[PDB]
Amino acid sequence: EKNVSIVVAASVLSSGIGINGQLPWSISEDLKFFSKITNNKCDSNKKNALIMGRKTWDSIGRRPLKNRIIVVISSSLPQDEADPNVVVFRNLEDSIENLMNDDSIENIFVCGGESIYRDALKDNFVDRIYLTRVALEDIEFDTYFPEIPETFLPVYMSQTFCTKNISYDFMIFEKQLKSIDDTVDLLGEIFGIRKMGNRHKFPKEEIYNTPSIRFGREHYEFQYLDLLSRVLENGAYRENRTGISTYSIFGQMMRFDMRESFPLLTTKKVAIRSIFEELIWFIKGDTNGNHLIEKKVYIWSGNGSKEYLERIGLGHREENDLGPIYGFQWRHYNGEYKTMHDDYTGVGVDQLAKLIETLKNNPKDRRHILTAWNPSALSQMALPPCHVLSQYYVTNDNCLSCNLYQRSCDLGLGSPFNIASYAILTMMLAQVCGYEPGELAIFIGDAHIYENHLTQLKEQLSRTPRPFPQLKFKRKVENIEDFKWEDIELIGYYPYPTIKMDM
Amino acid sequence: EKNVSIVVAASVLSSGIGINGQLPWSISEDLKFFSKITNNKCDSNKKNALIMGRKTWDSIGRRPLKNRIIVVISSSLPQDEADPNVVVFRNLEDSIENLMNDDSIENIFVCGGESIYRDALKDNFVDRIYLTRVALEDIEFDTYFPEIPETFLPVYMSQTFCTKNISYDFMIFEKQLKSIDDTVDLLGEIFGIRKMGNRHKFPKEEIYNTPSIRFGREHYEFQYLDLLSRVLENGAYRENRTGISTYSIFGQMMRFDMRESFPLLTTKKVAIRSIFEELIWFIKGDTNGNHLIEKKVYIWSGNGSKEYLERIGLGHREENDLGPIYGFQWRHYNGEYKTMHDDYTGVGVDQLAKLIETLKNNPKDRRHILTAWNPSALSQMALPPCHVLSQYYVTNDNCLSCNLYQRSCDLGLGSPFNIASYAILTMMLAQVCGYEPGELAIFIGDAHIYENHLTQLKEQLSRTPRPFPQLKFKRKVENIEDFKWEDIELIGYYPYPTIKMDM
């Protein structure tokens, strides 16, 4: 009665594992993971057993594996005891005698084609599934991994890794002291809102994304999803200026890795071109909303109309003429603003150019700060800034990281755009300065959820996330302004369908 | 063979429990905790047993406790079966027959003076200790709680609570799946710094404050101590202009509760008077450093001397004319700086006054922002600001919370001072606006530790923290400027000795 585990690497959507008798990919770290998971034992005198079909045995070239016993399931292969590293059995069920008969085996692993994966899943002897989710779907497969029965539950999901611009995860599925929790609950009954834990309750299982993953929430998309759950659990109802009521919690944080993946949310399809188009719009220092609507982008349409520019206190602006906004505060901080149809080249202080200069000539500094919150020009701008501050950091191994502070953040539509926007911005700065992308950390003040997004956000929490895509540039640019959408390649992006959330 | 637990409330330093046959205090919530921990059972048909000495039985007035059996250990009291709620035994050892003989009892509790605590701890009958750490030492005791043997280890430490300006904690002591951790460790060997977990390793047991508390790190001083441990674990070495090297990690967070305590560090004595004098100096909008040196405050003495005013470029200033720093950016943001002793009344925008006006007349707003990072006046300052941003938030129950972003923060001497400085500031803003203090959250960019503080900071990490003190105001002020040191009352502050960390 030992431990039997399935080890497989399959595509994220199609769940394919092979093509023409070979692997569909060449991921060096995946094979390393295979060797480390199949050699992991406790007793030095026992060995681990690896079960595979004949075609899989032919697939790996009929060459043994060090420190492991290979069990091949075939009806034609000859059985000879001259090689103890390879053993041949006639069926999978009778090959599971390693627990009953052989006491020189600690753990068994099933890893051999769909013929064996199918039978092993139906026979109720497998206790665990080690799954590597490869983000490859362009090519075709002839052997697939069977669907995981409902009896297994995900317990671990690693961060996204990269190998030759290919993204992949690592997942575990499992077939499925205390006086502290009872003392904390009793303390929470005595003190009401006086105990801070009651103000920061853990979200209930009905609003927790993939609740069976209780300890292996390594995948950094959970940083956003779990923040979404915390607002749904203990968010306070707040009426506002109009009728769009929110639920707010104050002081939150989420961080993302940019060294091996691009944090583009996979639990819903995120329009990345419009995110990129608004970022270069910021970088170029532009304030004209018509430049955005001329590129099929309507993010700043409701905040720049004539009705919205006359009920806030203005009204003398053009049709879509936001005032000193993001970009004008990055490239021309302070400085007198006239209209949208002027050239502000050389006015104010250019924080972005000074940032690039300090990143390349003083990397170990601690003043790489880009602010967009100008209290003097708040009442002459269309909407006060939400990404009020961003600080950048050069690690010892030549990586550029980024901190972002947001006073405001709609989790429904704002956060997915801000995460990708400041990740692209950091990668763009990283290439210009000669660095590699590092980490991103988002600090949020008033994290809120609009009431008309509840049904829709509760659908996103029902989707198990997928590995992050890759974002790579084609050419190497000279200045930050020369970036265009033609230079961006989004690789391995396989999101769930869109979620129409109206603003 | 059931479960025997000690329940006691004792002083934080002296560990005294009684005086003249009564309790030294009157903490209502402590008695409520006593009732909830002693009634907590699983079977509805069983009862819990409470063991106490006769003097303790006399202490509670010889009146029974509902739904519980009281066992009195005395050598004179009579034994009569007329009352099944009170049973009298002649010795402690023979009174522990509830596990052997009586099957109508689920859990046993020891809670009766040092004579019984001493015997129960020496006889190896106690499996758990529920300790309430009361922060009272002025009065004298005649009965103490015996020292906790080394076989027990702390597993839980609640946040600090308040009752009649008296602080107290709740602690638990105990006498002393897996495939996920092995897969993460194997993944961490394949990928080096490519796995974000290896860049954010958990600190080793030798630099973790109170390592036995693995899940009950409720006390919010652990937010600082664990941040200190993370820098010691994966901080990167960084040379600078001279030879004073630091160890930095980027993007960190710690939060504190202000509804029931004041986050003044107890693992080392923090000088509170000098912190307060610089804070009101900020509020008054003053930029002249001599105002601080006239009150035995040398925070801005080394940064405003003639040696420091010739290497930044501002050599034409007076002896102590720091310039546009915290305070001038709060009260007279933008504008223009001339000298230190002239009148800037009416210049720029007053963020602090606009903040106070908006906090009471627009509490549900989301623009309660106080910034001090001005890119136009950065090169006109003695030292660029460290508390670059602070946002405030009014909860639905009329509480004022605060977020703080720090681009730089020396954990050795700066963070303990910044935590107390902005906690006092939030408490002062809360009284003026008619609110109560809420939560405090610190967001740190470059969290660093100076190399000459390593031995000293590792000493602070060996000290188990104590309940936070209380900070209360004496009078009610009219304006934020009228606060004085005479109006501040620090109650129940019992820190470990100071740690001389030289700069």
Ligand SMILES: NC(=O)C1=CN([C@@H]2O[C@H](COP(=O)(O)OP(=O)(O)OC[C@H]3O[C@@H](n4cnc5c(N)ncnc54)[C@H](OP(=O)(O)O)[C@@H]3O)[C@@H](O)[C@H]2O)C=CC1
């Ligand atoms: N991505 C991944 O993790 C992995 C991918 N692969 C890929 O999968 C492909 C091969 O797998 P696949 O095509 O499904 O073939 P299989 O590996 O499942 O092996 C099938 C063969 O095993 C024997 N066999 C199977 N079932 C039985 C049975 N019930 N009784 C007796 N003998 C049995 C038969 O051999 P016989 O002719 O002797 O009777 C059969 O032809 C390869 O391309 C390989 O690269 C393989 C392993 C892992």
Ligand SMILES: NC(=O)C1=CN([C@@H]2O[C@H](COP(=O)(O)OP(=O)(O)OC[C@H]3O[C@@H](n4cnc5c(N)ncnc54)[C@H](OP(=O)(O)O)[C@@H]3O)[C@@H](O)[C@H]2O)C=CC1
């Ligand atoms: N802060 C807290 O959590 C608590 C505080 N207290 C305080 O402590 C004080 C009282 O405790 P304390 O003074 O230590 O007295 P105890 O509560 O320990 O009770 C002592 C009495 O129990 C009997 N007794 C004790 N040991 C033995 C023994 N080995 N064999 C037989 N009988 C024994 C004796 O009664 P006899 O005379 O018959 O010999 C003795 O007088 C009070 O002020 C009370 O308020 C009490 C409980 C909890």
Ligand SMILES: CN(Cc1cnc2nc(N)nc(N)c2n1)c1ccc(C(=O)N[C@@H](CCC(=O)O)C(=O)O)cc1
């Ligand atoms: C059966 N098979 C196909 C294959 C490929 N990748 C997988 N990946 C996973 N996660 N799971 C599988 N079952 C799996 N199977 C294999 C098995 C081992 C080797 C292999 O070369 N192993 C070397 C690994 C060499 C190295 O360290 O990279 C070893 O010594 O164990 C190749 C293909």
Ligand SMILES: CN(Cc1cnc2nc(N)nc(N)c2n1)c1ccc(C(=O)N[C@@H](CCC(=O)O)C(=O)O)cc1
């Ligand atoms: C023995 N004793 C002294 C006393 C006081 N505080 C303590 N506090 C702690 N944490 N632990 C103790 N053992 C303890 N003991 C007691 C015990 C119960 C009551 C008491 O009044 N209990 C009521 C509580 C009433 C209420 O709910 O507030 C009950 O119904 O149990 C007073 C003193």
